[PDB]
Design a protein around this ligand. Structure first.
Ligand code: HEM
Ligand code: HEM
Ligand code: HEM
Ligand code: HEM
Ligand code: HEM
Ligand code: HEM
Lengths: 279, 279, 279, 279, 279, 279
């Protein structure tokens, strides 16, 4: 069984730790910020732009990542250097998660723990769905948009078949975007969609800074119901990297509470609320 | 000499403390937040809406305030109740300051200290003006706007003969507003003015929250050079209440440094900087 | 259904938010500090001294408050201006609460949620009463006093039929005051009552500052068992404004734990404990 | 029943407070730091070196401590001065705890509460043992060492029949030390033992400072699996003074979670984790 | 020259560090809390009650302390064990300081630095005296009392020939106490003295907690001008242990500013101000 | 003159800001963390591994960096895309600095300010050198080592002609390394050198965490005088990237104070001190 692991992809790293493999992690990419301790480990750079020399320097027994791990030539030279490179799935669905956990469990030597993790996860999701069903008795599902930002610019809208879409659906909202994947869209169209709430995952900014930057670069969003009712929600971007992660259930609880404010929220930083208005 | 003082108007209160009369203050209005300890004294409400019963309860020997202290009927019933009511000047000029200090010094019994205060103040201002003169050798004075907000709404623009205008001029900027006093102006006109920087004094919000609210309610400001270059500066609103206060010199140093970024700033929380852009 | 709400009275505002009406609140009075976000909304001043021009500026569809909302002439001119003014009950009893929730639920469009709120509240109270019954098996109910202070002065003692009395009773204590309402009482009498504990709700001070101010202005309290055993408890004053609020249950848990120290406390900032003694 | 208590021995003090006797404590030794408020009470010095004049000055009705309370001559002169000196047991076992609680309950007048405390404690321990049994199905008990340090020096290893040994066993680990009591051992032997994890209870240092000091003065520990896998755990030293204390159950939950990382931890500052590695 | 030093007496330790001997300090007594790092060194207990075994364990080349270091028998057994024990002076005067610095400089090997330290110190004091002279032109020296407390109790008043008296005089105040040394005095007499300000050095409490405890145990102080004008100043107690220390000059600047509020304070945590009143 | 700048190399970015060009910076590499606001700008990745698509997305008018900016192919494709790529000097000497400032000043349009910056810098250095000369009268220059770490591993020692060497020399120390550039060296040799102090610049760790990691991976350093006397100094790594930066003067003041502890330090987070010992 591999003893020295290097992990690329936030959620993958969280899973390794969750399954008890923290002491086996010798290096991680920049999107791996949870738990907090992972930030103090050697860095191999961004997952989409791995540093070959960086991973080799750690004498890794295994390198794990998803489809979004690369570039391809660097991964190839790594394999040629004797490094065991595994590719898990970043797809936004339980089938993928259950498959990733199966593998991680095996390479870690804790197949039972991996099964228990899958079980607790689905249980959390079943509970989240039941809470939503009850909440929709007094309020219909709101139309929402999830956008990925870079200091408020270069907006990418989460369309169908993305982690962002999965998160919006699982939290009880209706994704207003009908396209596939993450794609840029004119603010004009976005404003026309008039979302009840907008979820912002910014790579560089957080809280009010993220909100302010968003409005600076996309003034058209100010006339949306989302901006008017103080519903520009800031989400922890790492929640969307490397496939479905262990913190999503807590994330869904916070989002669904914001989506159905007239319902007693579920029990249990990853979601900043808006305190400003427009009228 | 009066022993129990109640003060209405932020800057007036700061002066009493500055001259050593802190132990004589038994109550203050809500705009008196400096020094921090003044927030722990009994409150008589907002200066423009004093609570008669509130001041009487403190058995004050003297009540001080400016023209903006009121309403008139309440001040009258107070005088009729035997309370000594003094009215100082809130006018934005050294002549007024020097006159206010003269009186405060006398009622406090420290005429010499009051003179020294006037002297240090003007010295600070002379130094600020010389720094600006040198700074304008490599950069011309920027056109700027100062706005008073309420959670980003109900914008009042500081025109000529206001504390806001005095502050912009003393900090080396050109007030773009040509009207008199504080008046509401359409965002359309404001955006047309295209300020290099915008100074925001919000009664309820601070930092990025203030910026975000401002943009939400006034989307048109996003296309100004101010928003584009990350120059929506947030100023401590108390710096503009009750006439010229003792903290303005430090305030001018921060503003002038932001107005002439290519000059080594002057020596020495009251000014939050912008970190977002638009491009 | 009203879309823009202005609320006067801490507890009322908390309820609107609790029922999911936060995005409909456009302004609140100074006693509305919970949740924290409410402090960033436009302010209409103190509930007992509303600013007419202040509420009108917000174009409110409805203004809610209790009997303690005023003054009367200002509320009248508001009604004459077309503003819908509703008056709920501030009375210290479940009948009033259940009636306030009924109305809020209707004007908010969530009658079921309001019913669920009433249900959870009474359940919390039933649980608090059972815990007390069990706790009184090893210790008798302590005689206590609840005082409202202003920077430690102008003390008002909570007598019968006040929110303070309701809170003392519901927390398992015996209110030593036999008068009706909130009334000033000489420290001499208060010290004679010799409370086992004293609860202080100060408008301006908190923690040790509140304790120190209390003792400075009322030296006679130092010889009470309360002062001797380090039981000058500081309570969040907003818990007593605008009728019975949603945070009282958590407040009762903290108080009852302090009142019966030999009992395992109930599950779950609003109550500062004393660490000083006298002997 | 005694009204003024002076307590020597961290855990004893915690118990007095836990049973509701906080207002009866007029003084404590330096190892009594929990709850936090106990640090603000008069100090009688270190438990092993009590200040006679220090306790007498407090006019105590009773002085409680364990075998480790002294020196003997000082305790004697105290008894001769009329002070009631009680000696409880510091022995690392439930029989001793149950006997200490029995006495404290009686002198405090809350025999029932003391019984309930014993009951909750054993219940917590039964639950901890069951969790461990389940955790050992996928992982065998790890060999561990517990050391008491002084700014990383003067290391004492917890052998058999010590609170440290009790804590390691109850948390699911195997104490690698075979000696009796706390004894100094050469780092050479300690490194040879090659612990999977090392628990450090430092009197002066905490967190990374404690780790760094430990390695500075005992370089040989760097080659242990504990140092390599980032498992130099820092434990709150007060958890080991004055017999079995009320916080141990929470302490065991944290330790056992660190000892069996592949198990979902138990529900609920006293244990700092290691983030550094060696490879 | 000695390489391993153990120091008893706050101010002595500060001097060793100030002269550059920090790396030579291997242990200190509990009153040595400055700089902050000294708290992380091995502890030898309280200066007046040194732990023989504690110092020996550190293999010290030298042990330094003042007259207040003891007890005598422990110091004797230490000398008999080969430990070099030096006794400096704790007397409240420059002659003593200059003599202590002379010795420390020699044993540390930096005679010139010690001379420079004496020079800077006296210069600081000359500047403090000149500032006071100018301040007394508009205000006469206030009568003040300095008290040493233990969680607000066991009050010792600083009389003539004490560090407390030296500090009051050097800060521009008149010590109202006419006795010699530190002695207990009835609150009745203390209140009669009616100090303009009271300086409290509490061993266990700080800030408002110290104030509250003081008033609880000495209610009579509430009617003093000091309590009425919010002038119960809390001083860092370590400033008074082990003779004249390097932080006194900064301490004098803060005190003199509080004593002459109508004077612009001198340039540059050791003095907490009072925010409560009585009227 | 270029309006949109992207900067790679910490010190270069600091200079642009220092000269007043902050509003012209639209993106920076990961080593640009000062001022703090630069962390909120879009990221182009690590300087040695720039993201082509990342810079192009910002529509930059100019890209600045040093020799260490790359890789080469990416810079080439950038030039081919019309991006103006400038290469400044990272060499550790004033000639290089003065040349970089000359260029930055010109492209920014503030040649005079750039000259003033060069002037203030050299003045700071002249003052630092004079302070050292005086300090060496009572103490000889200490032999020191500066190491660059990665979570305490992969140690690179700063030899001749490196920013690390420049910093050690300018701070009054003697670099014990005789090799050229940054090179790995066995801990055996490093320990043999027996440095009086060791300066650690860790890419991932800070403070005690950095110290602990260093000792874990390099146990041999524990027997050095540096470890024994608590002189493992942690330096802000960004101070060594992108050539000589504006914060070095403050950095030199802190280091030289640590190198000559018996000298009164110079006036004015970038240097963490060691509090642990070995003996
Ligand atoms: C906080 C500042 C710094 C950060 C964030 C940083 C980050 C990185 C990253 C992400 C890598 C790729 C992974 C790896 O190979 O380790 C790297 C490589 C490297 N870094 Fe840095 N670095 C910093 C400071 C420095 C400094 C001060 C030096 C020392 C002169 C340095 C020298 C190197 C070297 C030699 C490499 C190898 C690859 C190459 O040079 O092309 N870095 N750094
Ligand atoms: C944090 C919450 C509170 C704030 C911010 C607040 C603030 C104020 C202010 C500004 C005044 C006017 C000045 C004065 O006359 O003292 C006032 C008056 C008054 N307050 Fe409050 N108050 C609070 C809580 C309470 C509570 C809990 C009570 C007790 C039942 C109360 C009873 C009164 C009374 C009796 C007056 C006299 C005037 C009147 O009742 O119309 N207040 N308050
Ligand atoms: C932090 C400081 C300040 C606080 C706490 C404060 C608070 C208030 C409050 C509570 C009201 C009543 C509600 C309303 O009508 O909006 C009010 C009204 C008003 N305030 Fe202030 N204010 C502050 C600063 C200022 C400043 C700097 C100006 C600008 C010159 C200003 C101008 C006004 C005006 C024009 C009104 C309308 C009513 C009147 O002027 O009589 N306020 N303020
Ligand atoms: C933060 C600094 C201080 C600490 C930590 C401290 C601690 C202690 C402790 C633990 C005791 C033993 C218990 C007792 O008898 O109360 C004690 C006793 C005593 N302390 Fe201190 N002390 C400090 C400052 C002072 C100061 C400034 C004075 C005043 C001149 C002082 C005068 C005394 C006296 C008179 C005793 C009685 C026993 C004797 O003097 O031998 N202490 N102290
Ligand atoms: C935070 C808690 C603790 C504090 C504040 C503390 C403090 C002290 C002090 C001040 C001394 C005297 C100086 C010396 O000889 O080192 C001492 C001695 C000693 N301590 Fe503690 N201690 C603590 C925890 C412990 C623990 C958990 C043990 C381990 C079983 C322990 C065992 C000893 C021993 C063996 C001595 C030698 C003298 C004797 O036992 O009589 N201490 N301690
Ligand atoms: C906190 C987490 C994240 C960090 C630290 C991060 C960082 C980066 C960096 C440094 C770049 C290179 C510069 C650039 O082209 O902008 C980049 C590119 C990119 N990132 Fe991320 N990223 C994060 C999250 C995400 C998420 C959630 C998405 C959305 C699905 C995403 C999608 C992309 C895309 C599409 C690119 C373009 C290049 C490519 O895909 O190969 N990133 N990111």
């Amino acid at each position: 069984l591999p003893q020295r692991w290097v992990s690329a992809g936030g959620s993958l790293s969280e899973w390794v730790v969750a399954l008890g493999g923290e002491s086996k992690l010798v290096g991680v990419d920049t999107t791996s910020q949870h738990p907090q301790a992972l930030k103090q480990l050697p860095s191999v750079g961004y997952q989409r732009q791995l540093a070959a020399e960086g991973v080799l320097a750690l004498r890794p027994d295994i390198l794990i990542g998803t489809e979004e791990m690369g570039p391809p030539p660097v991964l190839k030279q790594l394999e040629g250097a004797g490094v065991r490179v595994e590719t898990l799935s970043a797809k936004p669905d339980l089938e993928a998660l259950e498959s990733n956990l199966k593998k991680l469990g095996d390479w870690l030597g804790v197949p039972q723990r991996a099964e228990a993790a899958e079980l607790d996860y689905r249980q959390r999701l079943r509970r989240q769905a039941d809470w939503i069903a009850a909440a929709q008795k007094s309020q219909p599902a709101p139309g929402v948009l999830l956008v990925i930002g870079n200091a408020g610019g270069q907006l990418l809208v989460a369309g169908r078949n993305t982690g962002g879409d999965w998160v919006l659906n699982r939290a009880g909202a209706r994704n207003l975007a009908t396209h596939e994947g993450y794609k840029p869209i004119s603010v004009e169209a976005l404003a026309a969609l008039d979302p009840v709430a907008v979820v912002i995952a910014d790579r560089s900014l957080e809280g009010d800074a993220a909100r302010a930057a968003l409005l600076k670069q996309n003034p058209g969003l100010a006339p949306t119901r989302a901006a008017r009712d103080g519903r520009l929600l800031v989400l922890d971007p790492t929640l969307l990297v490397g496939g479905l992660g262990p913190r999503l259930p807590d994330g869904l609880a916070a989002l669904s509470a914001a989506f159905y404010p007239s319902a007693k929220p579920l029990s249990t930083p990853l979601l900043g609320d808006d305190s400003t208005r427009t009228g």
